Amino acid sequence: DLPNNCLNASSLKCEIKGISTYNVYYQVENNGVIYSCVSDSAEGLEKCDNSLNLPKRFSKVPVIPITKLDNKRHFSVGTKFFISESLTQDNYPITYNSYPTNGTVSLQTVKLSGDCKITKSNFANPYTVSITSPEKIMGYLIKKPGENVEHKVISFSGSASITFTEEMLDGEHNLLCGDKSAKIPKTNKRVRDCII
Amino acid sequence: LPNNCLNASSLKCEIKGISTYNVYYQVENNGVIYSCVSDSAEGLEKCDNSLNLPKRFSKVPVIPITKLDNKRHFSVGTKFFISESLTQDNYPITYNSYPTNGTVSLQTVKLSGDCKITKSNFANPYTVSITSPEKIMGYLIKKPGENVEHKVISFSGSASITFTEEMLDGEHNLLCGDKSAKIPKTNKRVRDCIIK
Numbered sequence: 001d002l003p004n005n006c007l008n009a010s011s012l013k014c015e016i017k018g019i020s021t022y023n024v025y026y027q028v029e030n031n032g033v034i035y036s037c038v039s040d041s042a043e044g045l046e047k048c049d050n051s052l053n054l055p056k057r058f059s060k061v062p063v064i065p066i067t068k069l070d071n072k073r074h075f076s077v078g079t080k081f082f083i084s085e086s087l088t089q090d091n092y093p094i095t096y097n098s099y100p101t102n103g104t105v106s107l108q109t110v111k112l113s114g115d116c117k118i119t120k121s122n123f124a125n126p127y128t129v130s131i132t133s134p135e136k137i138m139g140y141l142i143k144k145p146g147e148n149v150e151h152k153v154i155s156f157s158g159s160a161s162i163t164f165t166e167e168m169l170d171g172e173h174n175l176l177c178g179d180k181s182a183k184i185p186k187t188n189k190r191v192r193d194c195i196i
Numbered sequence: 197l198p199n200n201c202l203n204a205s206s207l208k209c210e211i212k213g214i215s216t217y218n219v220y221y222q223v224e225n226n227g228v229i230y231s232c233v234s235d236s237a238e239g240l241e242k243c244d245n246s247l248n249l250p251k252r253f254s255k256v257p258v259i260p261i262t263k264l265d266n267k268r269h270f271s272v273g274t275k276f277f278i279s280e281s282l283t284q285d286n287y288p289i290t291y292n293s294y295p296t297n298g299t300v301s302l303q304t305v306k307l308s309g310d311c312k313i314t315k316s317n318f319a320n321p322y323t324v325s326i327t328s329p330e331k332i333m334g335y336l337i338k339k340p341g342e343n344v345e346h347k348v349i350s351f352s353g354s355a356s357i358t359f360t361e362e363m364l365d366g367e368h369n370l371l372c373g374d375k376s377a378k379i380p381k382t383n384k385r386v387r388d389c390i391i392k
């Protein structure tokens with residue numbers, strides 16, 4: 001059990017099958033046997049086939065999929081591949097990340113996740129909100145309901161300060177950090193520009 | 197309209213898949229197959245291949261696994277989830293009563309929600325109590341890799357637990373939604389006294 005053949009994609013013939021917003025699904029081939037694999041950094045895919053639409057770096061923000069269909073529009077954070085069990089008994093061995101196992105690859109929408117200490121109350125600068133997380137890395141995002149807004153994920157760690165843009169304070173906008181979620185109310189237009 | 201996917205006893209229906217916490221079936225009304233997933237196991241007795249249907253489903257807070265490293269420690273069964281098809285087209289599905297497009301995908305799962313294990317339950321030291329603020333909750337003891345297809349226990353409010361000689365070896369592990377716990381191994385010479 002050494003799926004390191006997926007580590008060598010620089011020189012082995014590989015085809016790009018699918019591309020998500022947070023991982024990549026491909027399959028290499030060494031001695032006449034295909035090896036489906038999923039990676040989170042895409043280091044040796046430059047010479048693969050369909051090595052066309054892939055990015056420099058997946059931002060590595062912890063994300064878990066959606067169970068709440070109703071919460072889709074409220075928690076769309078993009079697409080990420082996950083190891084599912086095949087619909088047939090098919091036990092096809094895929095090596096998600098560095099861990100090998102069987103199952104089938106399946107693309108699912110995901111949500112943000114973790115322990116974002118969303119600091120509602122902030123002493124000074126009420127228009128500036130702070131956000132902390134004990135996790136090593138953590139991701140947040142500000143978006144309206146839906147909008148098909150992908151990316152806009154920020155790799156933050158520990159201390160993080162957030163200010164709102166002029167349009168952003170439209171009440172329908174929502175701040176997503178970790179599991180937690182809040183809604184920003186529309187501030188008065190004349191209270192704005194009074195900052196001067 | 198997900199009509200007569202609740203009336204499936206009035207239609208010719210084909211049982212496609214059965215998981216631990218939900219069931220997948222397709223009904224046929226007038227020319228086109230309706231794919232639907234549910235949890236009641238009601239009205240599906242007259243469907244085809246409905247031989248191994250469970251009485252009811254536990255319907256506990258349940259999320260799938262991400263880190264494949266933790267399947268062995270947190271395996272609690274299999275649950276059907278709505279995903280996105282690898283190809284472009286996506287058949288409309290009506291999970292519960294919620295209609296949407298996509299494809300089905302079977303995934304093993306972990307218990308979800310929030311539990312608060314009374315870690316130091318001095319009162320009857322060998323019996324401890326759990327409290328869940330949610331309306332329903334799931335829990336089960338399980339050593340890594342132990343076959344657990346329906347050993348779960350539907351949990352609401354606050355309840356207590358009494359252990360077994362098997363379950364008090366150092367290998368068994370306590371599971372309750374979002375929390376994990378390990379059981380210490382009592383010497384078999386101390387076991388014969390608690391047996392009284």
Ligand SMILES: *[C@@H]1O[C@H](CO)[C@@H](O[C@@H]2O[C@H](CO)[C@@H](O[C@@H]3O[C@H](CO)[C@@H](O)[C@H](O)[C@@H]3O)[C@H](O)[C@H]2NC(C)=O)[C@H](O)[C@H]1NC(C)=O
Pocket residue numbers: 001090091092093101102
């Ligand atoms: C699914 O993935 C598992 C993970 O490796 C694969 O399991 C392997 O299946 C083989 C069956 O050929 C088993 O190994 C056997 O062990 C016995 C005991 O020594 C030995 O006498 C046999 O000759 C054979 O080697 C075992 O279940 C397992 N091996 C592991 C985990 O090391 C399985 O092949 C995959 N399913 C597929 C590809 O359909």
Ligand SMILES: *[C@@H]1O[C@H](CO)[C@@H](O[C@@H]2O[C@H](CO)[C@@H](O[C@@H]3O[C@H](CO)[C@@H](O)[C@H](O)[C@@H]3O)[C@H](O)[C@H]2NC(C)=O)[C@H](O)[C@H]1NC(C)=O
Pocket residue numbers: 288295296297
């Ligand atoms: C899911 O597949 C079905 C069929 O392929 C589609 O579902 C429904 O499709 C209609 C047509 O696009 C959606 O909206 C309607 O659009 C027409 C455009 O002129 C408009 O006149 C109507 O007032 C209505 O807005 C409808 O929302 C959609 N519903 C669902 C539940 O899917 C559709 O192709 C696929 N779904 C999506 C979201 O694309």
Ligand SMILES: *[C@@H]1O[C@H](CO)[C@@H](O[C@@H]2O[C@H](CO)[C@@H](O)[C@H](O)[C@H]2NC(C)=O)[C@H](O)[C@H]1NC(C)=O
Pocket residue numbers: 004005007008
């Ligand atoms: C991946 O590529 C490297 C580079 O060729 C392989 O390393 C070779 O290993 C074989 C022995 O199995 C020998 O040809 C040499 O020891 C290495 N090559 C050179 C040029 O020294 C490696 O085996 C490949 N496969 C894996 C799984 O890593």
Ligand SMILES: *[C@@H]1O[C@H](CO)[C@@H](O[C@@H]2O[C@H](CO)[C@@H](O)[C@H](O)[C@H]2NC(C)=O)[C@H](O)[C@H]1NC(C)=O
Pocket residue numbers: 200202203206
């Ligand atoms: C399930 O089927 C029954 C059929 O007896 C439905 O009862 C009527 O169904 C027709 C459509 O065939 C509707 O037009 C009527 O309005 C229904 N009668 C009512 C609502 O009193 C029933 O609606 C179906 N759906 C369920 C029970 O959820």
